[PDB]
Design an enzyme around this catalytic site. Structure first.
Site, short mmCIF file in Angstrom:
data_model
loop_
_atom_site.label_atom_id
_atom_site.label_comp_id
_atom_site.label_asym_id
_atom_site.label_seq_id
_atom_site.Cartn_x
_atom_site.Cartn_y
_atom_site.Cartn_z
N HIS A 93 0.87 -1.21 0.00
CA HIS A 93 0.00 0.00 0.00
C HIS A 93 0.88 1.22 0.00
CE1 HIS A 93 -3.47 -2.53 1.34
NE2 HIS A 93 -2.46 -3.23 1.81
N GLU A 103 -0.72 1.89 6.05
CA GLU A 103 -2.04 1.60 6.67
C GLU A 103 -1.91 1.73 8.17
OE1 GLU A 103 -3.60 -2.08 4.54
OE2 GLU A 103 -4.73 -0.36 3.71
N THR A 195 -7.63 -5.46 5.43
CA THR A 195 -7.78 -4.00 5.27
C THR A 195 -8.44 -3.58 4.02
OG1 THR A 195 -5.66 -3.72 4.23
CG2 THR A 195 -5.70 -3.62 6.69
#
Ligand SMILES: Clc1ccccc1OCc1nnn[nH]1
Ligand SMILES: Clc1ccccc1OCc1nnn[nH]1
Ligand SMILES: [Zn+2]
Length: 257
Positions: A93, A103, A195
């Site tokens: 990410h 995150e 997530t």
């Protein structure tokens, strides 16, 4: 149709995936002063010598490097874990800018990116069964900061122009994920979730304290990827991170003093 935009992003997910507002959602902020050292955590064992990488895929949300998980070749054991967790894939990410992208956060600090090495508990037989279990998955999370280049990342960044758009894949054999680790395996651990949709509450999170350094040039190339498919208007694959969720009735444990 979920994604990371204004209209389909993390604030919208709960309407299709109501577990978005559940009791064990991820990521979270790791408050380093409140996490408690847990002397009973057993040592963490990352055994990736026999890892067999296969393919790299742009799935419209990130890019995934997939492994052969049909036997115990690359596994995570120990730490908070009971039993054996097989590596199936890793992905990242990242942000539009170096000040955001991870995150998990550390005392509210955002890193440029976050690596997730995804593993499933072999007592459940396959990945799809494992995600229905509260101890089904173990994700090893590794922060990325921008600094010196990470040599063991460069094979990844160099193949990205071949999987620019959603649904593109490339051969990705003979990649050794050990090159993505920091020196220290000191970690925080807590019970959490995927997530992204379906946000299943099936993950033991193991987040390394020591980030890896990657170059601005390396992370710049992540940002040239596309969320869209070929022949669609270009939407740069940036800011594919979910913000920190409420800790609720959970304790984050540290492996280190
Ligand atoms: Cl996350 C996942 C992996 C493999 C197979 C199914 C999966 O999600 C199933 C699901 N979808 N919505 N709730 N559970
Ligand atoms: Cl690994 C996976 C399979 C299917 C749906 C979602 C999935 O992972 C989401 C996730 N969790 N932490 N980072 N990405
Ligand atoms: Zn992830």
């Amino acid at each position: 149709h979920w994604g990371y935009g204004k209209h389909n992003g993390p604030e919208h997910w709960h309407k299709d995936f109501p577990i978005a507002k559940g009791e064990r959602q991820s990521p979270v902020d790791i408050d380093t002063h409140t996490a408690k050292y847990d002397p009973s955590l057993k040592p963490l064992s990352v055994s990736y010598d026999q890892a067999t990488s296969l393919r790299i895929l742009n799935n419209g949300h990130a890019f995934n490097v997939e492994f052969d998980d049909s036997q115990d070749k690359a596994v995570l054991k120990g730490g908070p874990l009971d039993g054996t967790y097989r590596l199936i894939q890793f992905h990242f990410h990242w942000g539009s800018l170096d000040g955001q992208g991870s995150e998990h956060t550390v005392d509210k600090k955002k890193y440029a990116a976050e690596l997730h090495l995804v593993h499933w508990n072999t007592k459940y037989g396959d990945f799809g069964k494992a995600v229905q279990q509260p101890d089904g998955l173990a994700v090893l999370g590794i922060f990325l900061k921008v600094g010196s280049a990470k040599p063991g990342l460069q094979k990844v960044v160099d193949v990205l122009d071949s999987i620019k758009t959603k649904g593109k894949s490339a051969d990705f054999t003979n990649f050794d994920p050990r090159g993505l680790l920091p020196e220290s395996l000191d970690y925080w651990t807590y019970p959490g979730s995927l997530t992204t949709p379906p946000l299943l509450e099936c993950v033991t999170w193991i987040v390394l304290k020591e980030p890896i350094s990657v170059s601005s040039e390396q992370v710049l190339k992540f940002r040239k990827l596309n969320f869209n498919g070929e022949g669609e208007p270009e939407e740069l694959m940036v800011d594919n991170w979910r913000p920190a969720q409420p800790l609720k009735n959970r304790q984050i444990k540290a492996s280190f003093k």
